[PDB]
Amino acid sequence: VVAEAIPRPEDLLDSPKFPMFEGSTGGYMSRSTRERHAITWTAKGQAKFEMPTGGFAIMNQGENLCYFRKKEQCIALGKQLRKMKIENYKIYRLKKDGTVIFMHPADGVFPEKVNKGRVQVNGRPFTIRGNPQQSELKFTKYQGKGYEADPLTTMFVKARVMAFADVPNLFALPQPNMDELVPAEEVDKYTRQEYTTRMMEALKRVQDDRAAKAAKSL
């Protein structure tokens, strides 16, 4: 798809592409706004239509060009044109510098028609109820945005919910020994792979002690 050369509306006064329209106060507010949206189309007959900004208009038998402040007005006019069996209309966003961005028929095929090369953006692979609970994701990446969680996080919190209901079989986290641990950070033994072995043996000692203590009055 080739973007056209839509000029800035303040530099294209009196263009032959402009349809005959009455002109109202509803048009884009100059002297305060510099971002304009332009919609172009090619018609077959001078059929009267309604401008999104109040007032009616008559197309041209050839090319047409209109400028609007908002993309919504351009899309409304596009739907109105498409109701009149007028395809091949393109909607551009004009930056303040004059950069032309091609917006509505982005890949050249209207969004209601399946086109190859598209990928489901903002897709979630479950029913809407499958979203994780907001309470589970507190102070994580998804603090108040449980609907933004990746499906792996949703499954992880679901498994956590499943686990944290069998209370008797849970493992209480041992209380840290603050007074005798906690040396200066430079005082470490390195041996990271040995540190997990130390984790294993210390947790084994904790579990054995807990079992021995429980097997006294239980």
Residues that bind another protein (CB under 8 A): 25, 29, 31-32, 125, 127-136, 138-139, 144, 146-147, 154-178, 181-185, 187-189, 195-196, 198-199, 202-203, 206-207, 209-210, 213-214, 217-218
> Among residues 84 and 163, whose Cβ is nearest to another protein?
163
Residues 6 or more apart whose Cβ sits within 8 Å of residue 149: 131, 132, 137, 142, 157
CB contact at 8 A, 41 and 9? no
> Among residues 13 and 165, whose Cβ is nearest to another protein?
165
CB contact at 8 A, 1 and 108? yes
> Among residues 104 and 124, whose Cβ is nearest to another protein?
124
CB contact at 8 A, 18 and 51? no
- The minimum distance between CB 11 and another protein, in angstroms, equals 20
- The minimum distance between CB 59 and another protein, in angstroms, equals 28
Q: Report how far residue 125's alpha carbon sits from residue 154's, in angstroms, rounded to the nearest whole number.
A: 11
> Among residues 101 and 170, whose Cβ is nearest to another protein?
170
Q: Which residues pair with 42 in a beta bridge?
A: 63
- The minimum distance between CB 5 and another protein, in angstroms, equals 27
Phi-psi region of 127 (alpha: psi -120 to 50; beta: other; left: phi over 0): beta
- The minimum distance between CB 102 and another protein, in angstroms, equals 21
Structure tokens at 6: 């839509």
> Among residues 114 and 181, whose Cβ is nearest to another protein?
181
CB contact at 8 A, 130 and 154? yes
- The minimum distance between CB 191 and another protein, in angstroms, equals 10
